[PDB]
Amino acid sequence: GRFDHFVEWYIYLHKRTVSDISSSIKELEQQVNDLQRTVDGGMVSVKSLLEQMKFKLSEAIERNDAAVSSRVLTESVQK
């Protein structure tokens, strides 16, 4: 059995439990609001600075809807 895989998974679960859950989705969407300043009053072309997070948040939400619904369990519950 892949016990090293278990150790890595358990450590990842503890990292996602001790943090990233008290704030939840609080600071991740804050970067859009912060970078909107450079979008508005900075350079006309700014897509290269906001090309990944825009759909990263959407894919993170569509992956975490399992963790928030009656679906794939939360990290704390699995741990």
Interface ranges with a second copy (CB under 8 A): 30-31, 34-35, 37-38, 41-43, 45-46
Q: What are phi and psi of 11, to 5 degrees?
A: -65, -40
User: What residues have CB less than 8 Å from 32, skipping those under 6 apart?
Assistant: 50, 53, 54, 57
CB of 2 to a second copy, least distance (A): 32
For residue 28, give the 3-state DSSP assignment: coil
Output 53 or 67, the one with its CB closest to a second copy: 53
**Tokens 């928030």 sit on residue:** 68
CB of 46 to a second copy, least distance (A): 5
CB of 25 to a second copy, least distance (A): 16
